[PDB]
Amino acid sequence: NVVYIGNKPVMNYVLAVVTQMNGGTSEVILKARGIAISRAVDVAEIVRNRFIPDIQIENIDICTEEIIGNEGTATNVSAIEIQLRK
Amino acid sequence: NVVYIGNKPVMNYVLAVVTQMNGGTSEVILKARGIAISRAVDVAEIVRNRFIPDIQIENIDICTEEIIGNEGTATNVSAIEIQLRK
């Protein structure tokens, strides 16, 4: 389950998800922070639109998390969680 | 009561939202496509965390919109919808 979207190409994450669900896994949750947020929405839509029609988007949550940014100091980021179920 | 979120500074949008919701309008829909998706979630979080603690996130939808270029070029863009309510 749980697939963290980062700075790798969207397709890499799309392939991760798909492999997992073709392999039998029923649920994956996409997690992303900040700028990767739009890329997580991208992974969800591509997987549904091109690979696993059937896939249900169960529940989407957003929150705020705290991380230490590139400058060395604490900072708050938006985050998203997308529950995929086949 | 629908706000389109693009590439303007985040606070521009936050302003528009808060003003509206404090001055009556009890429901508002955030909408964005592509990378603005990130800005859109930020706006929501900044509102719910900094300005109107009470606010409720009614519903988040995602989908793919298709747009046509001047020349005929069809593009699939990811898109999001965030319903807020006080």
Residue numbers in the entry:
A (entry chain A), B (entry chain B): 5 to 90
The authors write:
The Sac10b protein family, also named Alba, is generally regarded as a family of DNA-binding proteins that are highly conserved and widely distributed within the archaea. However, unlike typical Sac10b family proteins, Mth10b is an acidic protein which contains 13 acidic amino acid residues and only 8 basic residues, and its potential isoelectric point is only 4.56. However, electrophoretic mobility shift analysis (EMSA) showed that Mth10b does not bind to either DNA or RNA. Although Mth10b has no ability to interact with nucleic acids in vitro, the overall structure of Mth10b still closely resembles other Sac10b family DNA-binding proteins.
We have determined the crystal structure of M. thermoautotrophicum ΔH Mth10b at a resolution of 2.2 Å. The crystal structure of the Mth10b monomer is of mixed α/β type, and consists of two α-helices and four β-strands with a topology of β1-α1-β2-α2-β3-β4. The strands β1, β2 and β4 are parallel, while strand β3 is antiparallel to the other strands. This structure model covers 86 of the total 91 residues, and no electron density was observed for the four N-terminal residues or for C-terminal Asp91. Two adjacent asymmetric Mth10b monomers interact with each other side-by-side along the long dimension of the monomer, forming a dimer with a crystallographic two-fold axis perpendicular to the long dimension of the dimer. The overall structure of the Mth10b dimer resembles a body with two long, extending, flexible β-hairpin arms, agreeing well with the dimeric structures reported for typical members of the Sac10b family. Helix α2, and strands β3 and β4 are involved in dimerization, through hydrophobic interactions as well as hydrogen bonding. In addition, each monomer in the Mth10b structure contains four salt bridges: Glu31-Arg89, Lys35-Glu85, Arg37-Glu69, and Glu49-Arg52. Though Mth10b is an acidic protein, the concave surface of the molecule corresponding to the DNA-binding surface in Sso10b is dominated by positively-charged residues, but its positive electrostatic potential is much lower than that of Sso10b. The other three pairs of conserved positively-charged residues, namely Lys16, Arg44 and Arg83 in each Sso10b monomer, are substituted, respectively, in Mth10b by neutral residues Asn11, Ile39 and Thr77, suggesting that these three pairs of residues should be key to the interaction between typical Sac10b family proteins and DNA. Mth10b mutants N11K, I39R and T77R with the neutral residues changed to corresponding positively-charged residues acquired DNA-binding activity and the triple mutant N11KI39RT77R exhibited even higher DNA-binding activity.
